[PDB]
Structure 1
Amino acid sequence: DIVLTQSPASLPVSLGQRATISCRASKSVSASAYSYMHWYQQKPGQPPKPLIYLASNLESGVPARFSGSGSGTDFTLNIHPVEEEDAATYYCQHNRELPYTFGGGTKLEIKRADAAPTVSIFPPSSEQLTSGGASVVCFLNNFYPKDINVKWKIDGSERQNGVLNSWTDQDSKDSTYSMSSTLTLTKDEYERHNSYTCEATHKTSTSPIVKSFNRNEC
């Protein structure tokens, strides 16, 4: 089968600039007067949407910012200028022969002014303690870049087992990320310690952001 190799896998670009995504095929997809290499855009939770067909033709309704070119085995998709709503994943796909195949995709990240997170900490609910478990939750909302380290501390001792960290997709309006960090314990283990703390070390600050509570302080 024909293999389509996209590049780069992930592309950060600042607002207003242009993004260049390339797609290379194992074999030529151009026969005589036409080239069979189409592009699609998929946003989170949505299906992929056609942007450009037959190498350089614009789909109806697609903004003029999108353009395509290429022939033979090499093809390129251009977006100039990029905007917030373009945060998405883009795929190339060929039609020259069966079976049709897709490229690996290219995630478009809108470069964003470094922003620090708003951190909140929540102790276990009485309903959960009734069940014999105890989860401590730490929210980190609206920051950038995406990478960020969260460290849990029980009575000043680091804890990395039993932690679940989940990121949202890049927001389409403000281009920020948010993440949730959950530390799950047993009720009896939660009740033999006093201090609980999530520390957020991020590129935005020299020292980490710290939120904490004490079990018996109320």
Structure 2
Amino acid sequence: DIVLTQSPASLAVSLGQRATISCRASKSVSASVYSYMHWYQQKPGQPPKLLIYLASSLESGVPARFSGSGSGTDFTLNIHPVEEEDAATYYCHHSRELPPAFGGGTKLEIKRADAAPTVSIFPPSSEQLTSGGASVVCFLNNFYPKDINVKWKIDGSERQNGVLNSWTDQDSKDSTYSMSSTLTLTKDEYERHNSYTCEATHKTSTSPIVKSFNR
């Protein structure tokens, strides 16, 4: 059939600039001067939505900053100017042949200045200690870029076991990143230790940010 390959796989464009994403088809989808293509935008946790049909046309209700062009086997998607709400995963679809297929996908992100994370660590609840478990959870919010590291230190000793890290997608309005780290340990390990330290290593800080508490 017709295989669609989009390049690149991920793109970061600053606000006010232009974002160009190409959809390359293995075979020509153009039939009778009218090419077969559809551009889809999909946000995380939502179904995709149509944007550009026939590669030359904008759908009613879709803002005018979204546009596309190209003929034959090479199509492009041009978004200018780029806005904070434009961050999402983009797709392309060919109706020319059967079976119809979808593109490999491209994730557009907003580029801006770097930001330092806000580190807050929460001791385990008394309800969890009743069941016999304990979880020391540490929150890191509003940091850019997404490259960051979290180090757990109990009583001055680093413990990498029992750590659950979860990263989010880029915030629409803030264009920042957020993550958490959960250190799970038994109540016996909770009563036999006092100091619980959460450290954050980010490109905006030469030294790790220390946020801790005492039992």
Deviation at 1:118, TM superposition (A): 1.0
Deviation at 1:109, TM superposition (A): 0.7
Q: Matched residues, percent identical?
A: 96
SS in 2 for 1:51: strand
Q: Mind listing any 5+ residue stretches in structure 1 that lack a counterpart?
A: none
Q: Report runs of 4+ in structure 1 exceeding 4 Å deviation.
A: none
TM-score by length of 2: 0.97
Provide the rounded CA distance (Å) in 2 between the counterparts of 1:71 and 1:132: 65
Structure 1 residue 194 and structure 2 residue 189: aligned?
Answer: no
Provide the rounded CA distance (Å) in 2 between the counterparts of 1:8 and 1:159: 38
SS in 1 for 2:102: coil
Q: Mind listing any 5+ residue stretches in structure 2 that lack a counterpart?
A: none
Deviation at 1:117, TM superposition (A): 1.0
The superposition leaves residues 127-174 of structure 1 with CA deviations (integer Å, 9 ceiling, x where unpaired) of: 101111110000111111111100111122212221111122211111
| Aligned twin of 1:44 | 44
Deviation at 1:32, TM superposition (A): 2.3
Deviation at 1:42, TM superposition (A): 0.9
Provide the rounded CA distance (Å) in 1 between the counterparts of 2:50 and 2:142: 30
TM-score by length of 1: 0.95
The superposition leaves residues 90-127 of structure 1 with CA deviations (integer Å, 9 ceiling, x where unpaired) of: 10111101111111111111012111111111111111
Aligned length: 215
| Aligned twin of 1:177 | 177
The superposition leaves residues 158-208 of structure 1 with CA deviations (integer Å, 9 ceiling, x where unpaired) of: 122211111222111111111111111111112211111111000111111
SS in 2 for 1:50: strand
| Aligned twin of 1:108 | 108
Provide the rounded CA distance (Å) in 2 between the counterparts of 1:70 and 1:191: 66
The superposition leaves residues 1-31 of structure 1 with CA deviations (integer Å, 9 ceiling, x where unpaired) of: 3211111111001000000101111111112
Provide the rounded CA distance (Å) in 2 between the counterparts of 1:213 and 1:17: 44
| Aligned twin of 2:72 | 72
CA RMSD of aligned residues (A): 1.0
Please say which of residues 77-86 and 151-160 is displaced more in the overlay.
151-160
SS in 1 for 2:101: coil
Structure 1 residue 24 and structure 2 residue 24: aligned?
Answer: yes
SS in 1 for 2:114: coil
Please say which of residues 87-96 and 40-49 is displaced more in the overlay.
40-49
SS in 2 for 1:139: strand
Provide the rounded CA distance (Å) in 1 between the counterparts of 2:158 and 2:80: 47
Deviation at 1:69, TM superposition (A): 0.9
Deviation at 1:53, TM superposition (A): 0.4
The superposition leaves residues 31-72 of structure 1 with CA deviations (integer Å, 9 ceiling, x where unpaired) of: 222111110111122221111001111111211111111122
Provide the rounded CA distance (Å) in 2 between the counterparts of 1:155 and 1:208: 17
Provide the rounded CA distance (Å) in 2 between the counterparts of 1:105 and 1:155: 46
Please say which of residues 62-71 and 81-90 is displaced more in the overlay.
62-71
Provide the rounded CA distance (Å) in 2 between the counterparts of 1:161 and 1:105: 35
Provide the rounded CA distance (Å) in 1 between the counterparts of 2:212 and 2:66: 48
Provide the rounded CA distance (Å) in 1 between the counterparts of 2:188 and 2:66: 58
| Aligned twin of 1:94 | 94
SS in 2 for 1:165: strand
